[PDB]
Amino acid sequence: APRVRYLAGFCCPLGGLAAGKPRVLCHEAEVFLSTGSELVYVYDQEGGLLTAAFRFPDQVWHLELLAPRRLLYALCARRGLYCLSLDHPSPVIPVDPDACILPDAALCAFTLLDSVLVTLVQGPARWKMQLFEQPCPGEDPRPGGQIGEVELSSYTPHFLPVLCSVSPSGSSGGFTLEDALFGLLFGADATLLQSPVVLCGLPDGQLCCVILKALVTSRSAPGDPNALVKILHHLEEPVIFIGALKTEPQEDVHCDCLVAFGHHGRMLAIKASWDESGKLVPELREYCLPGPVLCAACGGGGRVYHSTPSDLCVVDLSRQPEEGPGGLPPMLCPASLNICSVVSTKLLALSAKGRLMTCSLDMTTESAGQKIKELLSGIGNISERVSFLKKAVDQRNKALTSLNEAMNVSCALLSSGTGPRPISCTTSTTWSRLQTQDVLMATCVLENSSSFSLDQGWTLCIQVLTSSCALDLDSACSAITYTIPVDQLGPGARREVTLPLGPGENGGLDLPVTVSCTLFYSLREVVEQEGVCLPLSRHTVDMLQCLRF
Amino acid sequence: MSSNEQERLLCYNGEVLVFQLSKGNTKTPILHVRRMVFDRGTKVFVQKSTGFFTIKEENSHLKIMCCNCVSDFRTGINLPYIVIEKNKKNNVFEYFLLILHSTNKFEMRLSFKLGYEMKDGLRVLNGPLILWRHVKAFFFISSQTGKVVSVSGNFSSIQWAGEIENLGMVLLGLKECCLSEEECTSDIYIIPPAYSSVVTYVHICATEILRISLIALTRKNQLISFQNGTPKNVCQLPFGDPCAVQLMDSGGGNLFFVVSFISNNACAVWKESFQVAAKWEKLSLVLIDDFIGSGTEQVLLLFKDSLNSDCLTSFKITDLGKINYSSENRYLVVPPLETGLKVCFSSFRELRQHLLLKEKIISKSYKALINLVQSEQLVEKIWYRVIDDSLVVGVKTTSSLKLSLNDVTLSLLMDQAHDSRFRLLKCQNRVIKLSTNPFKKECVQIITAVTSLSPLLTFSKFC
Amino acid sequence: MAVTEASLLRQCPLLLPQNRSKTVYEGFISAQGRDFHLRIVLPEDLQLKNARLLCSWQLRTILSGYHRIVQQRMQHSPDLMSFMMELKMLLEVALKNRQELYALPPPPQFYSSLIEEIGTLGWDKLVYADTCFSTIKLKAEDASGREHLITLKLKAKYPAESPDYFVDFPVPFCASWTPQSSLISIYSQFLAAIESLKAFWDVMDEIDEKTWVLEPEKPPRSATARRIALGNNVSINIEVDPRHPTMLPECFFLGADHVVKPLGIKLSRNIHLWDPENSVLQNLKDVLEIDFPARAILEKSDFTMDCGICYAYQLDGTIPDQVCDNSQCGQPFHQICLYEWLRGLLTSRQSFNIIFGECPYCSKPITLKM
Amino acid sequence: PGLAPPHTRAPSPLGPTRDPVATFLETCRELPPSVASIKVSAELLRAALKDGHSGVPLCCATLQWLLAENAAVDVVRARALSSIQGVAPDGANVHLIV
């Protein structure tokens, strides 16, 4: 009946967990789980009570499992890679360092193919792919000798990078493509050798694949990255999740499509066309989903179950080839980061608060009325909010309109049409009398000739500049500035402002004096350093304006 | 409620726990758990399981003290806690912290055993961590340590408590002061001490580096945001004596602050627009969890025990959108109505996208305005000084800027948002050249403006 | 204004020139209280002969099936101002055409008040509603106990404007709509029309019962004509005046020139003996001096074995020969008629002397071999 | 300003809606026209206005005498106006009739 259930939740921090890191895996009814912390949890799926609880040191970054063997690998961060037999004779278990293998310690990321193990290990500027044997017989669970190493030369460094296992058809915790595609992406080498291929998404958002057959090296024989590792498609943002989908569904699925995700959500999907040159050509889409994308799984039939911090949303690529857009629906679950998809769709996730939940998607005589009551109360509940959003839209619009008028005047002002049409500032010389002394006054007249109304957000800045030649000795007053709001000016319309310039102290008026008028536009008022000042005229008062007969 | 036959509620994992103490007779009172869940078919709460814990000593005054989820520090799993008092009439009060499992079984962690009763701001915290006060004496007992401890510091209030990134455990009691709960004592970018007189309950919501984004609510029935202590987006609250806030999600972005009042009444306020979206009355209780299994939070409202001597009769479960449940053919309108509901929701969730798009265009076009009219930092920086009734603003220059060739000034420009009128603003400009350690060699050219102050302090403030 | 300095502000308030050289405009265009995203790059000069104009996916789905219009408008139109005018109007048109998809009613009036008014009626009355709530159709009863239906189409504002009332019965129904009137008002007007026209209905009900009505089969209520069959291979069609039904109709007879003459002569002579106080049957029986057959053939009433294009037997020697390969149509044609018809249609193609293309009546594959 | 000789667009002063201290106070802490008239004897006004300046006897000459000390009296002497709308120092409007 309830499409979602509660299993458990946890110690969360504030808000909840970050992404890249926490991992959940579903075996049969066995369930695997990290919280990107020092704990790895296993839940019996029947009754969401715990089987087993493993304290590592140092924040588990990844889990994978080899089900035949009945083995769970973990990467501790500053330590290496542990291994655990699932039978494994309080329900807390600390690990013994017994279990540690390749304490390589600077290894971040790692996959598994059949009985091969791949790591991608931190260094200076060059990260390197290493690649180990993993003993096929039921022994002491050992590394063996490192077959291969490279250095991802293009990569020169919160966000892990990522690794995918991608096998071609005929030949496993990974993704089997179909021949069309495999041949298209990796080339004839990987095709012929039927070589499984390892896809690295890195924080730069370079998205690189390495063929495993061509990765055997030695101390005489040093793996050349330039040629051995290769670079598909540069998402400009970091990578989160690579995958592969059954488009056209008409356990080993011969998948048809390849999926990348950026962090901010440039999703990137790929397919074969075989079109328009009588030739196989690659089909590239960069979509732009929402938001921050926080984690992503894949389900039955071209359906990519993702998260934003808003909600848990979906794209379908099952449908020229693939599609114009991903416009995408929630199932109205929050930001779960750490999502997994089994196929039977019944998916599993970690709610950003702290929670493990299990989303399993799919008349009356006056109980029908209670239905109608409920529905109308609901539409009532919402109309409220729609109305708010309306008025907000109003405000944004009115902003653009005012904006528009501003930009149109600005452009008129910056043009030399050979008359300063839109707005003028005339300034003009008066004698007056105060107290005893005849004073020199500047009436500065602003006139709107044009249609355009200089509304709110606008301001005149006047500056009264003395004599020039900055001297040996710097004066008391280099200049004065007056600044004024111009509010709702309107067309034809007019301000007059009076300034003294005249001998205040010591009978000292030095000429020529220039008065400069300018305008600013204020972004904030109506709603890195940000405004615009615009020049009006700049009138020089000379003796001939200040003589009195 | 808090008594020998009286209960308390809680929410665990999209369901509702009832802890009731019950005099069993042979013996002393037993704690009984019901763990309930919502049917959606029969539109009621149905008992899924029970639980019992038998208490030994034949002493009266057993009492539930508080209840919530917490997270044990050992496992890191959200778990119900509960706190029991035992009082013997000895002036001795035990104060058990007992934890419940997946299995509906109980587990002691602290006995803790005071002589004097606990009261005021009891608040249980991650590593199941009791923290109380009497007469301005703060004490805590970690489950780790197992000792009574005192907080060294001397505070009036302990308004918020909880774990943060990098620190582990913290308190905000005085809005400067910013503790730990081992090594007692950043208090840099919190709220103003102006508010500190009126703030009665805080709720953080997020932490970056230190920068906390955070809410209040006051004795004045206010509600308030802050982003680096910039008091944005206030409301006003209908009711008197606000207690607390929770948060609720409602789906995408639709985030409400479900405020409870000592007056047995409560709000929702709708973030996006600090606005009372709904208000209800008498509200015996309130809980924020998914009782349906949709995948988004709701609120449960409980109405009073006058109605029945029974708890979860008189409920009202609600998203406050699409979901609303409570305690002549007509049908052909139904599919139309459901279809309206879902299409009103489509309009909501579209517009919200619409509104963001408008914001975005506006910004885009200013930046267009700025490259329209038009690299090297020609100015050091801004600084300002108050002398008497004189504003002195200044600026340090760079060697790039040649005052030999360039007449310069500096104005001041008032915000009309503050200044409803046109007062003119005059500013006097000085150029100051000083030689720095003369006994090439650095000159310091500084440029600086001067004006009156009392004209600007009209709105207690200005920018 | 005249100049596209201020007239463009006034007529496109939300189109912002990003660049100083007003070459990139971006933002919003209004249409039917809704704003659309549009980025319209000009060349370095003001020539729409060559320009870029990009759309949101919202806009392109709404301007599906005018792409050529807009592309030509760009190359033909002198100014941006006029171009925007043409575009605005064109959007207006596109949304009122696709009116099905686009409703935001104001619910607090609408869906609540509709339920209140439907409660005021009582819950037997409605028969149907679309999910978009746009259509409703209702029932009312006669004193006879006859069901009579009415289609109403409701707008964004039901109580503001008139609801369009679409109805069977044969004279125009007229509705005194005020904004103060409601569903029960127009319902009362509809019961008034019911009680008024009873006589006309009684007459046509009597006919359908006692006689072999031939051309309309389970006739609707709008029908004033009744092709009555009498004797064999002769019919009389009768159209009635609705307000004075009992009064004489325009009558005439189809069939054999030797059979039809005596009846016509007799009608001429005996027509002064028609009286509007009896029934049409009771007057026809004494005028035509006969009684009628009461379904002389009920099962093989008629299959018009006539062209079903020109609706005639014998077109220039040719007979209805070409039929439909369908149980539900069976409709004969003429070679000439069906060739002339199919030769037009887009769907049909012509093989050597063979044409495959859709039966006019049922749109199923039909083949014609000349 | 409405009657004035130039007939030029002078902006409305609108004396401040509040005291600075008053606005300061409110920030810190969170209708008919009035009329007067008189009557006076025409004989009195005639005898007092004779030394008869010129012009239409009364109402106009009355207003000219009342505002002989305001600067804006010569313009009203010209147009012979017995009712005008001035403002004030505080930006309130006043219509005064004779």
Ligand SMILES: [Zn+2]
């Ligand atoms: Zn024909």
Ligand SMILES: [Zn+2]
């Ligand atoms: Zn047919």
